[PDB]
Each structure stands twice: as structure tokens, then as C-alpha cells.
Scaffold this active site. Structure first.
Site, mmCIF file in Angstrom:
data_model
loop_
_atom_site.group_PDB
_atom_site.id
_atom_site.type_symbol
_atom_site.label_atom_id
_atom_site.label_comp_id
_atom_site.label_asym_id
_atom_site.label_seq_id
_atom_site.Cartn_x
_atom_site.Cartn_y
_atom_site.Cartn_z
ATOM 1 N N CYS A 1 0.849 -1.190 0.000
ATOM 2 C CA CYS A 1 0.000 0.000 0.000
ATOM 3 C C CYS A 1 0.883 1.238 0.000
ATOM 4 O O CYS A 1 2.089 1.141 -0.239
ATOM 5 C CB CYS A 1 -0.955 0.011 1.197
ATOM 6 S SG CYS A 1 -0.141 0.077 2.806
ATOM 7 N N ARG B 1 -3.475 -1.019 5.243
ATOM 8 C CA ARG B 1 -4.046 -2.101 4.448
ATOM 9 C C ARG B 1 -3.130 -3.290 4.183
ATOM 10 O O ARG B 1 -3.584 -4.430 4.240
ATOM 11 C CB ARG B 1 -4.545 -1.537 3.117
ATOM 12 C CG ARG B 1 -5.272 -0.220 3.274
ATOM 13 C CD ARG B 1 -5.779 0.290 1.952
ATOM 14 N NE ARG B 1 -5.416 1.685 1.721
ATOM 15 C CZ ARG B 1 -4.552 2.078 0.791
ATOM 16 N NH1 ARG B 1 -3.978 1.179 0.007
ATOM 17 N NH2 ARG B 1 -4.268 3.362 0.635
ATOM 18 N N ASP C 1 -8.892 3.854 1.082
ATOM 19 C CA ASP C 1 -7.839 4.290 1.998
ATOM 20 C C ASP C 1 -8.352 4.652 3.402
ATOM 21 O O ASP C 1 -8.851 5.756 3.622
ATOM 22 C CB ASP C 1 -7.105 5.484 1.376
ATOM 23 C CG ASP C 1 -5.832 5.860 2.124
ATOM 24 O OD1 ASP C 1 -5.224 4.988 2.787
ATOM 25 O OD2 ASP C 1 -5.434 7.038 2.030
#
Lengths: 153, 152
Positions: free
Chosen positions: A8, A14, A121
Site C-alpha cells: 500500500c 491495508r 484508503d
């Protein structure tokens, strides 16, 4: 047996969630697969974000978490597959990947078969946001582990 | 197999560092052992402090870390051994361990050939301090694993 990376922006949210969820499932089926995490952008941080790790203990993960990593040119050679969370992650990864290896790159959710292709996000968002995020990443995970379970005949 | 618990006050500094170094050494010794960390005091934090994580990198330890737990009555029956960094840690531990298990407690420096046997508080002092603490914790972990090889 197989080496997998997940990427990421910062390696804060993530990719580690992905990496932790991935390791549990690989482990439950005794699969010779290892997984790491890594960011594209370098951070001052040392450990993945707290909110990000709370969201996964709430679902029953006791995670030995790896420290923050930025992605390194050796990774494009070390790892058999490299997964991107959102496509902004996937472009930046491609501005840098040796042409001999662009075939390793695929988005995370690519094997889900779902309306979701990117993982949005979570950074500095609500805890409730992280709940959904953990599930999106969770679903993407089991598809992969079931997919990988197939190529071996 | 084996279970070992190492406790300090916050589970932020000492018990985490003790947790990594034991894993490294149990690894090197390819032993049937695993180790946990835990705090005594409650805390609303999720990861061990950074200054504590680096101090292990300086020494070439990969600090892949379980998040911070506080001690629970489950710890007294899951694990075979429980270790205090402080003696203050040992008062708090003894205040709550069932009578049939107080034979699990020990100091961490139990098997070190060193005079004073507490591990002081790195909170939240210089990295040089964390450097010292790491070797004191590192020194401690060597003696534990040499005994365990025969504590049977």
C-alpha cells in the site's frame, strides 16, 4: 514454496492487515506460503497504525506484526506474486518495477470476483470504517488462498 | 512443548524486548518453546514503544511483535513459567496468582550470575539507556535458555 508481498502507500494500514489476515489462513490450511508487507512511500513510523491493528483483534486475530517496510527492488525478484491495494498503489509500483517482472503485479481484490477491485484508503478514518475495510481485505484474502490452493495439482 | 510469560509494568518496553530476544535464542537453539509478553497495569495502547523496538534492531533483532496485553488469570494456567522484570512486577504478580501456581513465578534474571536482579525502567529514557537495558535483557535471556535445555 511461494513468496507473496502486499503493498500500500505507507505500509501502515491495508498491507499489514492484508499480511496478517493472509498468514492466519495460509496457516490454517498448512500451506507453504509466506507473505510480507511493504509500502511505496517511506514513513518515519516503525509499526503499522494502531486503529489498523485494533480492527483485527476485534475479529479474533492475535497478530505478531512485522515492522513498517518500504518496497525494495529486490522484492520484484524475491516474491512470486505482488499484490496492490488500490490502483494508485499499482501505478507507483509499475513506475519502478523491472519490465521482466510486471507480470507479478496484480491488485489484491483481483481474484475476489466482486464490485470491489480496489481497497479504499482507511488512513485516519473512523473505527467503523476499519471494520468494513478489514472485511473487504478479508474477502480478498480467502479468494487468493483458495485460488493458490488450486494451481497445485 | 513449552509456554513462558514475561511481564513488566506497561508491556511497552522490557517484557516486549524480552519477548523478541527469547524468540531469537529459542530459534537458534531450535527448541520446543514459545514465549509471551504482558503488562500488569492496564493500558490503552496497542504497540510497544518505538525506542524499545529500535534498541533491538541496533542489535540485529527483527522485532516482529505481539501487541500489548495486560496480565489475566488465564496467563497463570496457560504458561509454565512467569517472569518479572521488576520486583515491583513480582509484588503485583503475587497479589493475584492462585496458591497452587505461585511456584511459577521467578525474576527474569533468575539464572544470571549477576548481583542485582531487577531490570530497571527504560521509560522513556535515552536510546543509550535502551541499549543497556537490551543487553541486560539479552544477558538475562541466555541463562534462561541454557537451563530450559535441562529443566526436565
Amino acid at each position: 514454496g511461494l513468496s507473496v508481498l502486499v503493498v500500500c502507500t505507507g505500509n501502515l494500514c491495508r498491507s499489514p492487515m492484508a499480511e496478517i489476515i493472509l498468514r492466519d489462513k495460509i496457516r490454517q490450511k498448512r500451506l507453504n506460503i509466506q507473505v510480507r508487507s511493504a509500502g511505496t512511500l517511506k514513513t518515519g513510523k516503525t509499526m503499522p497504525d494502531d486503529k489498523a491493528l485494533q480492527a483485527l483483534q476485534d475479529y479474533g486475530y492475535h497478530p505478531m506484526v512485522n515492522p513498517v517496510q518500504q518496497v525494495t527492488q529486490q522484492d520484484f525478484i524475491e516474491h512470486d506474486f505482488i499484490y496492490a491495494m488500490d490502483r494508485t498503489n499499482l501505478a507507483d509500483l509499475l513506475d519502478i518495477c523491472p519490465a521482466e517482472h510486471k507480470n507479478k503485479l496484480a491488485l489484491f481484490l483481483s481474484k475476489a470476483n466482486r464490485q470491489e477491485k480496489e481497497v479504499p484508503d482507511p488512513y485516519r478514518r473512523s473505527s467503523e470504517f476499519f471494520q468494513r475495510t478489514a472485511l473487504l481485505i478479508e474477502s480478498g484474502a480467502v479468494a487468493l488462498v483458495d485460488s493458490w490452493q488450486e494451481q497445485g495439482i
